[PDB]
Every structure is written in structure tokens, then in C-alpha cells.
Motif scaffolding. Structure first.
Motif, PDB file in Angstrom:
ATOM      1  N   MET A   1      39.866  33.532  26.834  1.00  0.00           N
ATOM      2  CA  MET A   1      40.908  33.035  26.519  1.00  0.00           C
ATOM      3  C   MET A   1      41.565  32.360  27.786  1.00  0.00           C
ATOM      4  SD  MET A   1      44.583  34.504  24.948  1.00  0.00           S
ATOM      5  CE  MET A   1      43.809  35.572  23.792  1.00  0.00           C
TER       6      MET A   1
ATOM      7  N   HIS B   1      41.459  35.336  30.332  1.00  0.00           N
ATOM      8  CA  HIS B   1      41.267  36.667  29.902  1.00  0.00           C
ATOM      9  C   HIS B   1      39.922  36.930  29.317  1.00  0.00           C
ATOM     10  CE1 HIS B   1      45.785  36.485  29.560  1.00  0.00           C
ATOM     11  NE2 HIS B   1      45.700  37.927  29.444  1.00  0.00           N
TER      12      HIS B   1
ATOM     13  N   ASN C   1      45.848  33.669  36.945  1.00  0.00           N
ATOM     14  CA  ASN C   1      45.792  35.049  36.691  1.00  0.00           C
ATOM     15  C   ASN C   1      44.459  35.266  36.047  1.00  0.00           C
ATOM     16  OD1 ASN C   1      49.211  35.139  36.647  1.00  0.00           O
ATOM     17  ND2 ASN C   1      47.821  35.890  38.467  1.00  0.00           N
ATOM     18  N   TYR C   2      43.747  36.310  36.301  1.00  0.00           N
ATOM     19  CA  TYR C   2      42.440  36.774  35.708  1.00  0.00           C
ATOM     20  C   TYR C   2      42.565  38.094  35.362  1.00  0.00           C
ATOM     21  CZ  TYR C   2      40.305  32.790  37.882  1.00  0.00           C
ATOM     22  OH  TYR C   2      39.850  31.262  38.208  1.00  0.00           O
ATOM     23  N   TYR C   3      42.195  38.211  34.069  1.00  0.00           N
ATOM     24  CA  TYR C   3      42.548  39.583  33.432  1.00  0.00           C
ATOM     25  C   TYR C   3      41.120  40.019  32.796  1.00  0.00           C
ATOM     26  CZ  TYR C   3      47.259  38.261  33.747  1.00  0.00           C
ATOM     27  OH  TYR C   3      48.507  38.005  34.036  1.00  0.00           O
TER      28      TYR C   3
ATOM     29  N   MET D   1      39.712  42.276  30.154  1.00  0.00           N
ATOM     30  CA  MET D   1      40.319  42.957  29.173  1.00  0.00           C
ATOM     31  C   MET D   1      39.107  43.975  28.694  1.00  0.00           C
ATOM     32  SD  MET D   1      43.351  41.889  28.514  1.00  0.00           S
ATOM     33  CE  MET D   1      43.357  42.614  26.967  1.00  0.00           C
TER      34      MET D   1
ATOM     35  N   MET E   1      49.161  42.418  40.628  1.00  0.00           N
ATOM     36  CA  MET E   1      47.892  41.643  40.691  1.00  0.00           C
ATOM     37  C   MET E   1      46.870  41.825  42.043  1.00  0.00           C
ATOM     38  SD  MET E   1      48.132  39.969  37.726  1.00  0.00           S
ATOM     39  CE  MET E   1      46.496  39.418  38.060  1.00  0.00           C
TER      40      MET E   1
ATOM     41  N   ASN F   1      41.964  38.593  41.693  1.00  0.00           N
ATOM     42  CA  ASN F   1      41.950  38.304  40.178  1.00  0.00           C
ATOM     43  C   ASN F   1      43.220  37.164  40.093  1.00  0.00           C
ATOM     44  OD1 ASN F   1      40.112  40.160  39.381  1.00  0.00           O
ATOM     45  ND2 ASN F   1      41.589  41.673  39.137  1.00  0.00           N
ATOM     46  N   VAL F   2      43.616  36.570  41.286  1.00  0.00           N
ATOM     47  CA  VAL F   2      44.477  35.489  41.337  1.00  0.00           C
ATOM     48  C   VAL F   2      43.920  34.254  41.864  1.00  0.00           C
ATOM     49  CG1 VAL F   2      46.493  34.502  41.935  1.00  0.00           C
ATOM     50  CG2 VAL F   2      46.273  36.907  41.781  1.00  0.00           C
ATOM     51  N   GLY F   3      43.815  33.119  41.207  1.00  0.00           N
ATOM     52  CA  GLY F   3      43.014  32.170  41.609  1.00  0.00           C
ATOM     53  C   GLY F   3      43.942  31.156  42.226  1.00  0.00           C
TER      54      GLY F   3
ATOM     55  N   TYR G   1      43.187  36.135  18.003  1.00  0.00           N
ATOM     56  CA  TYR G   1      43.125  37.041  19.267  1.00  0.00           C
ATOM     57  C   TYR G   1      44.390  37.563  19.565  1.00  0.00           C
ATOM     58  CZ  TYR G   1      38.480  35.317  20.736  1.00  0.00           C
ATOM     59  OH  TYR G   1      36.993  34.919  20.895  1.00  0.00           O
TER      60      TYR G   1
END
Ligand SMILES: Oc1ccc(-c2cn3ccccc3n2)cc1O
Lengths: 114, 114, 114
Positions: free
Chosen positions: A2, A62, A97-99, A101, B101, B105-107, C95
Motif C-alpha cells: 500500500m 506498507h 515512511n516504511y512499515y 507489516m 521510526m 525505514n525513513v526515505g 485493506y
């Protein structure tokens, strides 16, 4: 996966085909089928980045796995590239921001992915 | 750091100068330069708190570090204070989700902060 | 708890009482008092799911505890049922990301829950 982009760029500046381009490129980048990729673009936002209001983007990606140091740097090169080319947003005014999950914490089709 | 406020308060009730004030206040609260602070305000939202459509806000603060028990109590006092004073939102109708964070995981700017 | 729905369904197709139904149902599903439950619905979004712009929804549910394998399956059944019934969104185009929040990372009423 997502991907969400929130931006102060106006709606008219989002070019035709942008959601499909994001879908296709994220499918390629995450190795996941395009059928599982969701994308959401939110223009015309009231936002600032570093105290100014030139074009900027606040984003999130995500995914169930495929999240990590090397992969996130690759995603960021990809997504900043698209945001610069298509929305004219400088890569240094983008946060993503990368998650990672857990499948049990993603709901879909009346259940989860667990 | 990144601060987002979603609220049912109308757009015209958002004071001029609010984004700048959040930026400066967060730079000082987090100890990070204002250049790394991003703020986003989303008015006119269809939302309820406790079943009530009285003014309310749902917010998030993401930061790479500077997130913990004491600090978050202090941020919550600061931000609720700001929301009460500037948007007339009662502190007891505000949720703020804090996210610490990892830099990987922060671009930003074609890469990550790792 | 806090539940957010972003969807490409228009504002007009969101039925009256929807926020209140979401609040009551989440009260019961989570076993949490309804006075603490926040809900937020964002229609008219520009989004795609699997590259398609048919009705879809990207959602989140946050909560200090009460997030887990079996509980999240039961939340997804409930929530997807509601979105199918009330907004005519196929469950397979939804989702829902679930977040088990630490009490120290949730801000409310000038403090946090730690
Ligand atoms: O007893 C409880 C009361 C409220 C919440 C809860 C946690 N939350 C976290 C974010 C937003 C809303 C929210 N509500 C969790 C509980 O276990």
C-alpha cells in the motif's frame, strides 16, 4: 502493499496515468503482483516541509516483508524519481515512511493474511 | 520529524501562521532543526470521537528517536495546548499516535536516513 | 480505539449514521467503551486497488492491546461486512492495517496512557 502520497501539489498537476504508473513500478520493485498493490494520492494538502510550502510529499509504503535497508533505499530512489518527474517535487522535500507489516495485522477479504 | 493533524474543525478556523508555529514548536520540542520538520493539517474531516461530532483531532508524530515515556507526555501537553488554543479543540477529544521510526525505514532524497 | 477509512466512494454514498454505527460496532468488537472510540471516513479519494479504480478502501485500526491473530480476523469480518453493506465495497478490495500501540505512545488529554 500500500503506497500513500500526501502532497500540496494541486490536483490538476497530477498527470493522467499516475496511479497506474505507481501500481506497476511498485509491483516491479516489491516483486509482488500488481493485483495486491494499492495506491492513494492526496493532492491539495495544507502542508509545510522545513518551514516552507514549496512542493513537498509525505508518503508511506506498507508491505508484508520486502522492507529493509537496501530495499528501502531502492524504493526511495524509485519513488522520489517518480515524484520529481511526475509531480515536480524535489527529492529533498519528500519523506517516505516504511512499515514492515506482520501478515496477522493486515486485514483483507473478511480475514487477515495470516 | 513529521506531525499530522486530522480534524473536523473547518479550514477557515485554522489560524494563519499555524503551520509555521507547529514547525517552530516541534523543532524546539524535538531538538531537531526546523529544516527536518514537516507538518500537515487536514481540516473539514468527517470524524467523531466518543460518538460525538464536537470538535476533535486525530494526530500523529513520527520521529527518528526523541520518542519515549517522558518526552511523549511533554509533546502531548504541547500539542494539545496548541490545538486547544488555536483550533478550540478540547484536549480530551484528541488522540496523538507517536512513532519512533528506525532511520532505515525513513526515505528522503533518493535514499534513507540509515 | 481509532478507525480510519479512506475510500474512492463519493461523499453522497456514505449513508447517514455510518460514523455512529462504526463507533458502536467497534465498541463491542473491541470490548472498549464507546466514549473512547474515534472514527474517521475520507470519501472521494483518488486511489486504486490492483490497478483498478472500482470501489475500494484503505483503512487502519489502532488500539492499545486487543490486536492479534484471532481478534484481527474477527475485526476484518466485521469491518469488511460494514463496508460491503453500507458503501458497496467488495471485501476483496479492502485493506486494514492493524496497529497494537504501546500505552506510552498514545497521547490524550495533555498526557499519555503510560
Ligand atoms: O482500554 C483501552 C481504552 C482505549 C484504547 C485505545 C488505544 N488507542 C490508540 C490509538 C487511538 C485510540 C485508542 N484507543 C485501548 C484500550 O485498551
Amino acid at each position: 502493499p500500500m503506497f500513500i502520497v500526501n502532497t500540496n501539489v494541486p490536483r490538476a498537476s497530477v498527470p493522467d496515468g499516475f496511479l497506474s504508473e505507481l501500481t506497476q513500478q511498485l509491483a516491479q520493485a516489491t516483486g509482488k503482483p500488481p493485483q495486491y498493490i494499492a495506491v492513494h494520492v492526496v493532492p491539495d494538502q495544507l502542508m509545510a516541509f522545513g518551514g516552507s510550502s514549496e512542493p513537498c510529499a509525505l508518503c508511506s509504503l506498507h508491505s508484508i516483508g520486502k522492507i529493509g535497508g537496501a530495499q528501502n533505499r531502492s524504493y526511495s530512489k524509485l519513488l522520489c524519481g517518480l515524484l520529481a518527474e511526475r509531480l515536480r517535487i524535489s527529492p529533498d522535500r519528500v519523506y517516505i515512511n516504511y512499515y514492515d507489516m506482520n501478515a496477522a495485522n493486515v486485514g483483507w477479504n473478511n480475514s487477515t493474511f495470516a
